[PDB]
Amino acid sequence: ENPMRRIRIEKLVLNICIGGEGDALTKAAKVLQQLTDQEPTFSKSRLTIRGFGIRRGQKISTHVTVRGEKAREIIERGLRVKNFELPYSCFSTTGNFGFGITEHIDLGIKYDPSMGIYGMDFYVVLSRPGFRVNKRRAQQQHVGASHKITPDEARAWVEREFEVV
Template sequence: MAEQGEKKENPMKELRIRKLCLNICVGESGDRLTRAAKVLEQLTGQTPVFSKARYTVRSFGIRRNEKIAVHCTVRGAKAEEILEKGLKVREYELRKNNFSDTGNFGFGIQEHIDLGIKYDPSIGIYGLDFYVVLGRPGFSIADKKRKRGRIGFKHRIRKEEAMRWFQQKVSAECFCNMGVQKPEHLMWPILSFAG
């Protein structure tokens, strides 16, 4: 029989990665955009989707409905693997502003070759945006077509919970696996994220 002082975690409250969205915005259609699509295809092994401009912006030379960006959505173990590479480039550090009020977080990297992709002179170097959507078991009821439900207030993910999950799972996991003592600058309490 379990001890009375020991409180079990509710498995329905467990946070997990629902999806990882990768985005490269080139700002123009043509050859540069197709090369950016090749970068995402090499990284994910999936066919990326092209995004169109919503408005015409003359100062940037962008026309409405012109393809200007490419993105890809990754789920499961592959999402965790790619996120691990991206966080390694960022040295496992995120600011408080990287987290949204709904418990998701995002960050960007300057060069895609930092992720371990071999440099190809014909492709060039592209920056990359990562956006991680967190979820709990039962979140799919809000996405259903028939008999759609709403996620209860207590079941929603808040910013502080996402930050705590990031500290416990991602940063602690990365340094424990390598057998290295966690550096002092990564031992922040929950409220001391760089603002």
């Protein structure tokens, strides 16, 4: 109930992973850039499994980080696709949660004949004010137990913000 202890959304990583197709990955990274306003970096893998074109450095996945209220807007739209219904398991040990969309068109972005349907992974990070104690270059210290966001507290916050029961 402390004003310096209010759960807020750290970010939204959007992860789209394909196999070895030549342009399937490029158009998808582009498909995220429009919603995000941040150019999604291409995050490759270092394991070559036969998979479907999977290799070391084969542009396996695209991931983009969106922070602030501009990402809250995206999170709510993705939750409308899930019918504002998330399972209990979606909350993590550290209180982080996630949900997933099947089609870029689901968010309402127009289907383009050029842009095929792309599935995405929505991962939402939950951080209270004063969590940069773990990240500051100078005087870095571990976040304390009370400040760390527990899963039970996290579940209550989601109903308060995105109205998903």
